[PDB]
Amino acid sequence: FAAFSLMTIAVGTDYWLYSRGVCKTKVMTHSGLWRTCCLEGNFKGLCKQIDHFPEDADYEADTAEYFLRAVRASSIFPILSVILLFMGGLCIAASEFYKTRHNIILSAGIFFVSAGLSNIIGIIVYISANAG
């Protein structure tokens, strides 16, 4: 329950990093997942929704700089941790009912393992495309 709470908080969050950027064009930045919100300026708390659009030399199918972005600005590996985590929480909740088959709670912990396996990948790709 604590892990599910902390992971859902960390997903539902605009405060992960702090850097110097802009708020809304066309500054110490209260930056998070997609809402690159900001503070300490002309206005404080206008959360621009960000995605990918560079102005490059037209990389055509540069996969390690394109598919990486596709996994970055659509969190699938971070969001799947919540899915597996509550999926295993349902099984540890369903331990009591339908019991005395000595098999079901083995299936539960696999979700808890694999969710952290998704989490570590999400952290790696987030730091990767921050410096990307």
Partner: protein
């Protein structure tokens, strides 16, 4: 016709070309191409290693799951001779 050859003979053209192209090396690579920085390793360099690590974890776990699947429920010493003859 006689003056241009004097300039070419005395290198005045070389001096002017150096003045108006090479003494104004300003932007980037001409000045900073012969310097050195040591290192600092970032995570963007080493990412596929972690990728291989996590994928191998998943593969090994899948192997054990189908092992427990099979042992919950070569062959014919004999046809091994067939197998090795067709392999040869």
């Amino acid at each position: 016709n006689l003056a241009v050859l004097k300039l070419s003979e005395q290198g005045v053209l070389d001096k002017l070309k150096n003045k108006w192209w090479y003494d104004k090396g300003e932007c980037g690579a001409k000045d900073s191409g012969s310097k050195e920085k040591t290192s600092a390793l970032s995570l963007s360099n080493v990412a596929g290693v972690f990728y291989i690590l996590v994928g191998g974890l998943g593969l090994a776990m899948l192997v054990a799951l189908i092992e427990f699947c099979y042992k919950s429920r070569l062959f014919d010493r004999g046809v091994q001779m067939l197998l090795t003859t067709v392999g040869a």
